[PDB]
Design a protein around this ligand. Structure first.
Ligand SMILES: CCCCCCCC/C=C\CCCCCCCC(=O)OC[C@H](O)CO
Ligand SMILES: CCCCCCCC/C=C\CCCCCCCC(=O)OC[C@H](O)CO
Ligand SMILES: CCCCCCCC/C=C\CCCCCCCC(=O)OC[C@H](O)CO
Ligand SMILES: CCCCCCCC/C=C\CCCCCCCC(=O)OC[C@H](O)CO
Ligand SMILES: CCCCCCCC/C=C\CCCCCCCC(=O)OC[C@H](O)CO
Ligand SMILES: CCCCCCCC/C=C\CCCCCCCC(=O)OC[C@H](O)CO
Ligand SMILES: CCCCCCCC/C=C\CCCCCCCC(=O)OC[C@H](O)CO
Ligand SMILES: CCCCCCCC/C=C\CCCCCCCC(=O)OC[C@H](O)CO
Ligand SMILES: CCCCCCCC/C=C\CCCCCCCC(=O)OC[C@H](O)CO
Ligand SMILES: CCCCCCCC/C=C\CCCCCCCC(=O)OC[C@H](O)CO
Ligand SMILES: CCCCCCCC/C=C\CCCCCCCC(=O)OC[C@H](O)CO
Ligand SMILES: CCCCCCCC/C=C\CCCCCCCC(=O)OC[C@H](O)CO
Ligand SMILES: CCCCCCCC/C=C\CCCCCCCC(=O)OC[C@H](O)CO
Ligand SMILES: CCCCCCCC/C=C\CCCCCCCC(=O)OC[C@H](O)CO
Ligand SMILES: CCCCCCCC/C=C\CCCCCCCC(=O)OC[C@H](O)CO
Ligand SMILES: CCCCCCCC/C=C\CCCCCCCC(=O)OC[C@H](O)CO
Ligand SMILES: CCCCCCCC/C=C\CCCCCCCC(=O)OC[C@H](O)CO
Ligand SMILES: *C/C=C(C)/C=C/C=C(C)/C=C/C1=C(C)CCCC1(C)C
Ligand SMILES: *C/C=C(C)/C=C/C=C(C)/C=C/C1=C(C)CCCC1(C)C
Ligand SMILES: *C/C=C(C)/C=C/C=C(C)/C=C/C1=C(C)CCCC1(C)C
Ligand SMILES: *C/C=C(C)/C=C/C=C(C)/C=C/C1=C(C)CCCC1(C)C
Ligand SMILES: *C/C=C(C)/C=C/C=C(C)/C=C/C1=C(C)CCCC1(C)C
Ligand SMILES: CCCCCCCCCCCCCCCCCCCC
Ligand SMILES: CCCCCCCCCCCCCCCCCCCC
Ligand SMILES: CCCCCCCCCCCCCCCCCCCC
Ligand SMILES: CCCCCCCCCCCCCCCCCCCC
Ligand SMILES: CCCCCCCCCCCCCCCCCCCC
Ligand code: NA
Ligand code: NA
Ligand code: NA
Ligand code: NA
Ligand code: NA
Ligand code: NA
Ligand code: NA
Ligand code: NA
Lengths: 269, 269, 269, 269, 269
């Protein structure tokens, strides 16, 4: 059977199949995913009147990210349970084509709209010094878009064409480093003028941002991190990838938004 | 196989079929579609108290457009994934009649109610000079309705009867030019009396409106933009059409609404 | 094939079947239906603080009508697409019994709870003179209930027993005329004491009410308006009936509610 | 065919089957059911600021009842349409085991949480004289729980074991009479100290409570009210039972809550 | 038939099958579950302005727990009805593999985000004396996470490997005792400085917490509480487990949250 330009999850499910644990876990971690986003949406809305009017735009953007995040991730959780059916004879879940092939695309388009908002909301809490608001914003939005788009193309060839998969991943990485660079400037200029408490938080935000955002490219390579025909090129790699995505999503959106809220309160009078 | 007066998407899916990329992409772009609309709905509601009471009717109408836009576009996303099933032997998605034929109708009825509201909300932010409120409104609502209705009829014959398809498309275009004419007047009269900042925004609103609204008729012809049996009369044309629709929808409703909100704030005291 | 006491839509779908246009259109018009109701619900809630506390009960009842309307009309839209499946050989949608027979019952029960509220809410905007509030209310609620119940019974025999269908329809009409009579009194007494502007609106409300409410009995007979084996006793009659219902529903609930809101503002200080 | 300890609806659907009217009606009355509850939820929330802060706890509990009532009753509606499929040959709906057997359980668990809240909310509007708040509450909550639990057990044997069905029904009745007794005291003590207007309402509340609550045990016996192999032990009895439940539910929750709201306003200053 | 590392519910359903009562009851108790959580969500939101701003964080966290709880518990409910189909011949519900194997995982990952919030919210109502806020928080969050994770692993081997099932259960218990220890300290330090009324409530909160939290490990062993081939290793054990979980969930989240709210009011001025 020819799957073509499909994610490696389909190849594992079509050949070896998934064990009760592998399948169930992936379902639970994706379910917990959209559950956290709807819980976060409620939090950011109920805590809007806890910061000065000038910082409230941060809670609004956090809520915007949560909504879309819930819908896309909710669909992604359905794309999984629908693409794999249990085989009584062997007692493993195999690719059910009638439910469509599983694709990490829904999550990539969730980033396309999130990335821009996540990078833009910090500009409503911190105050730039030598950098222009419009300038920083435009850089984030451009590099952010190019990073997602290029990566979205590569993930389609993560099996069919390993070369194209890495080339696009590399190009994407380029824009990723540029974002890290601009964000570093914003953090530094943000620390200037605020209390030691506010600086302490911005320091934590930078570490969170650095680690959480690095997990994404990690999940992208997950199936080949132990080389071809490696330990991760199995159902173990599938669990690992979806787990890492879930950890990254919660950290980069929910926790990131909570810290911005805490900073907003610290600067509130 | 007899399809009758059906959209060209069904003909491609019934003959050639769709590749993993073509099918998946179309699913992601439609999913992102309704996701953005629900995110926008939340934004316009949370920012109502950011403008004077006289301009708040603009945020309310934007929210009204988002709601309906979310429901119709959601149904459209389901109409896709349901109409095409994966074939293991060849590894392509083919027309699954049990899920009903795919039709871009749901999107046409979303416009019918939207168009009127989108054209009417700007009349709550800007002040007419040499034009009567009721007069302008009646023109938008009439031409707007005729434009959608005529187009809705033609799209059914985009394959079965190319002649009827173009004739209706032409008639529709007539009312489209009339709307562009009236909107141009509204923008000009709107600039008179407001600050240079407000004028700057109205200038951007006009450009956005002109480009975003022109994309629709482009998506209408998409399958024949490279002539019959052309490059676009394939799964590539299907992807292009649904992508263009999504770009147009986000720009004409969400972004258009954000700019109106920004102008409202600029005129707020 | 034995259908028994079923709506004529089932007979057309079981014999002739539905064309792509006939089926798709009916789906779009029903979809637009519930979409408008959810858009209206949001409008009436966001405009509650736009009228004096004494008139706000009108917006609340409008919202109550929208909710129930959305659910019932949504269920109806799903009932249609479920009752008819596409036949590849002939290329037409035929009755799929596994999805249950299509019935206009969900809409008849939507009226049962709506009619009472729609007639009751106007009594919170206008002021009676010689008529008692309780008296008028009791008449509307009684005649309203009997009108819906009797009609609900008749619609089951619109094919199986043409006699019973007309007899019940006639009895129903009796209570309909009584409602028109009481509503006429309410409008007259309502005009006395209010400004010419308020009177202008009440005049428009009466015209809207008269036309929109008359469309329902029109949709009831739709299949026989061109006599037995007539032009309307086809898929054309099916489209016509569902279209008329949608126009009537939007006019009698949403537009009727918007006009009452405008009158409330006119009388607000 | 072996059904075991199943509701009589399954036996009628498995043997005689259901006519278009019997099936459709049951679907409409259950649909109207959950529709009314969501409409009521919106009403109680939008009218919270219409009574003094001390009475607002009544609207909150009414809203709590509506929510859970909507979800359960919605699940009960789905349980119906899924358990019975149309047979083309005979033209009647028969038991479809793949959709699970129909059980009035979802409604019995809705009461388990509702009953306690419905009996408890009246204690926030009226003022006891010689009776202790905590004492009355504890009695309602205990007798209320025992009444539902015992009844829930009996309904499982309404066909399999007529003896057990009546024994449990009898035990349940015991706790029902005790509730009627305590509620009567609460009404009397409630009338003392309030205006004649408030007393008028409490009188209506007592009548509503007495009739609406008595309908439940009536629906419990519905299939045997005309003795075994009687007129009601048919599809007619099924329609009657689900109709009675719907009337009881709307009256005991929505109407009961509206009257409490009216009384709260009467006592509000 | 090979099930592998699956929950015991699947083994009972695959061999003996489930009776109408066993299946129906499990469905009702799980349905009531998510219904209570959505009812609680509405309560905590509508009662936020009933306590001083400093205690409102307790209501917000209660609402956060309700949301996630509703989504996960809803999924768990669907997982049940989908995994077991009725067999006409024997008249019992058997494992339907096409609907996936039933797993109590969705409820476990629900505790993962809940536990931390439930232990953290009490720190916003009570005031520590000799214990550091950050210190107590970190202990709860760590032990809480390890307790859930370890237990989540063990529940997969509750049949396949009884040894691993008990070992993990034991390790989990270790962290459970540590949580009970820290919570005991928090309660004691919380009682110091507050009124006798507040102390009375904290005493009730401690009893509720102790009993409700102990039920979980009880549901974990439920199938072996009467040893292998025991009375509980049947459909009776399945009902018991899901019942206990539901009672524990309502007590540990909803009731626990209500008491914290009542304590907040007691300390409010
Ligand atoms: C994170 C992204 C990882 C990319 C880094 C790995 C290779 C990049 C070098 C360019 C790829 C060219 C190698 C082609 C090949 O056949 O190997
Ligand atoms: C391609 C898809 C791109 C869609 C991006 C966002 C959609 C989310 C809708 C919400 C829009 C919020 C925009 C915003 O926050 O603007 C800040 C404003 O200028 C300060 O007053
Ligand atoms: C045809 C489809 C109609 C769409 C109706 C949708 C929302 C009603 C809100 C309309 C509010 C218009 C403003 C009224 C006004 O005059 O202020
Ligand atoms: C079929 C053809 C449908 C054409 C409907 C187009 C515009 C009507 C807009 C209606 C907006 C609601 C009325 C507002 C109003 O009446 O304001 C006073
Ligand atoms: C609003 C005004 C529409 C009136 C006439 C347009 C008639 C257009 C009919 C085009 C049909 C062409 C055709 O069917 O050719 C074979
Ligand atoms: C190709 C896909 C581009 C995707 C994201 C670009 C980000 C654009 C998001 C902008 C939406 C909000 C907006 O347009 O606001 C403008 C405002 O003037 C600012 O302050
Ligand atoms: C109350 C009167 C209702 C009359 C019932 C009816 O119309 O029955 C006609 C009969 O079935 C025609 O053969
Ligand atoms: C109570 C209402 C009962 C109404 C019963 C239906 C009356 C009716 O018209 O029955 C027609 C049938 O075809 C033969 O009479
Ligand atoms: C069974 C058919 C009847 C279903 C009724 C539907 C109404 C439900 C909720 C709105 C409550 C309306 C409250 C009316 C206001 C009373 C008042 O304000 O005095
Ligand atoms: C077997 C038939 C039983 C007959 C029951 C009659 C009285 C019911 C409840 C009394 C309990 C009083 C509530 C106790 C307060 C705690
Ligand atoms: C299976 C037994 C089910 C019995 C269900 C009925 C009894 C509990 C009802 C509501 C409790 C709500 C929490 C209220 C507890 C605090 C008391 C208070 O605050 O007054
Ligand atoms: C107050 C609390 C009552 C609790 C238990 C009473 C149990 C006694 C009721 C048990 C009913 C079972 C029964 O009647 O058995 C049917 C018999 O087998 C037909 O042949
Ligand atoms: C308390 C719950 C105890 C439930 C025990 C039910 C016993 C029962 O009702 O038995 C009837 C009959 O024996 C069945 O065949
Ligand atoms: C696995 C991760 C599970 C995390 C659940 C995150 C859900 C909601 C976040 C609510 C905000 C958390 C509370 C912060 C309150 C605060 O720190 O306010 C000062
Ligand atoms: C996986 C572990 C979850 C427990 C940790 C839950 C942490 C939830 C978010 C913590 C947070 O938001 O921290 C606020 C500042 O500190
Ligand atoms: C990382 C932790 C994964 C370890 C879980 C594996 C396990 O618990 O093994 C028990 C059983 O013996 C295996 O077949
Ligand atoms: C301290 C936290 C984790 C310690 C992990 C301890 C690992 C305990 C392993 C227990 C286990 O998985 O047992 C193997 C199984 O019995 C084979 O048959
Ligand atoms: C909430 C969503 C977030 C934070 C998304 C972040 C996405 C990235 C940081 C993506 C980066 C990638 C690369 C650097 C290379 C491979 C492809 C990507 C897109 C995964
Ligand atoms: C949010 C929805 C919007 C802005 C819809 C706009 C629709 C049009 C501008 C449609 C125009 C068309 C023509 C000019 C010719 C072909 C048919 C149409 C309807 C696509
Ligand atoms: C929003 C719902 C509304 C306004 C419903 C109105 C319903 C009617 C006016 C029904 C009238 C009928 C007759 C006069 C005879 C035939 C049967 C009816 C019920 C369609
Ligand atoms: C909104 C829910 C309400 C008011 C539920 C009420 C339920 C009862 C009054 C039940 C009574 C019963 C008996 C007295 C005997 C038979 C079994 C019951 C539970 C139906
Ligand atoms: C609302 C969710 C709550 C309160 C969850 C609580 C969970 C536990 C107390 C779990 C404890 C366990 C053990 C002590 C051993 C067996 C495994 C667990 C996780 C069930
Ligand atoms: C004030 C607004 C100005 C914003 C400037 C830049 C932000 C928009 C980002 C969108 C750019 C995406 C373009 C994609 C290029 C095509 C990718 C093809 C693959 C190489
Ligand atoms: C996609 C084809 C249509 C492009 C429309 C461009 C509009 C430019 C108007 C200036
Ligand atoms: C209080 C006094 C009146 C009680 C009325 C109860 C009515 C019960 C009806 C049960 C259903 C009967 C159908 C034939
Ligand atoms: C106050 C902010 C810092 C929080 C730190 C306190 C601890 C909370 C996070 C706990 C993380 C648990 C992760 C478990 C590790 C892997 C589990 C292995 C399975 C045996
Ligand atoms: C301060 C209030 C204390 C009570 C609240 C806690 C409520 C939980 C009640 C415990 C009862 C659960 C026992 C269920 C029986 C199921 C059979 C178990 C078989 C081993
Ligand atoms: Na599956
Ligand atoms: Na598909
Ligand atoms: Na309604
Ligand atoms: Na269909
Ligand atoms: Na309920
Ligand atoms: Na059915
Ligand atoms: Na949860
Ligand atoms: Na089932």
């Amino acid at each position: 059977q020819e799957l073509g330009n499909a994610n490696f999850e389909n190849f594992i499910g079509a050949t070896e199949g998934f064990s009760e644990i592998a399948y169930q876990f992936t379902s639970h971690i994706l379910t917990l995913g959209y559950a956290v986003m709807l819980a976060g949406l409620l939090y950011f809305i109920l805590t809007i009147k806890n910061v000065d009017k000038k910082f409230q735009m941060s809670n609004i953007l956090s809520a915007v990210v949560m909504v879309s995040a819930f819908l896309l991730l909710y669909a992604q959780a359905q794309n999984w349970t629908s693409s794999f059916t249990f085989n009584e004879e062997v007692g493993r879940y195999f690719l059910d084509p009638s439910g469509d092939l599983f694709n990490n695309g829904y999550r990539y388009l969730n980033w396309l709209i999130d990335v821009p908002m996540l990078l833009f909301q910090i500009l409503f809490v911190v105050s730039l010094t030598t950098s222009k608001f419009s300038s920083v914003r435009n850089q984030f939005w451009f590099s952010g878009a190019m990073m997602i788009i290029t990566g979205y193309i590569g993930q389609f060839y993560e099996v069919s064409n390993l070369t194209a998969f890495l080339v696009w991943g590399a190009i994407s990485s380029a824009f990723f480093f540029h974002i890290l660079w601009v964000m570093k400037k914003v953090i530094n200029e943000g620390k200037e003028g605020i209390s030691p408490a506010g600086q302490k938080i911005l320091s934590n935000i930078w570490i969170l941002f650095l680690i959480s955002w690095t997990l994404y490219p990690g999940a992208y390579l997950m199936p080949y991190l132990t080389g071809v025909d490696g330990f991760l090129y199995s159902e173990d790699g599938v669990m690992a990838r979806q787990l890492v995505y879930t950890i990254a999503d919660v950290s980069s959106k929910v926790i990131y938004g909570v810290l911005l809220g805490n900073l907003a309160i610290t600067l509130s009078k």
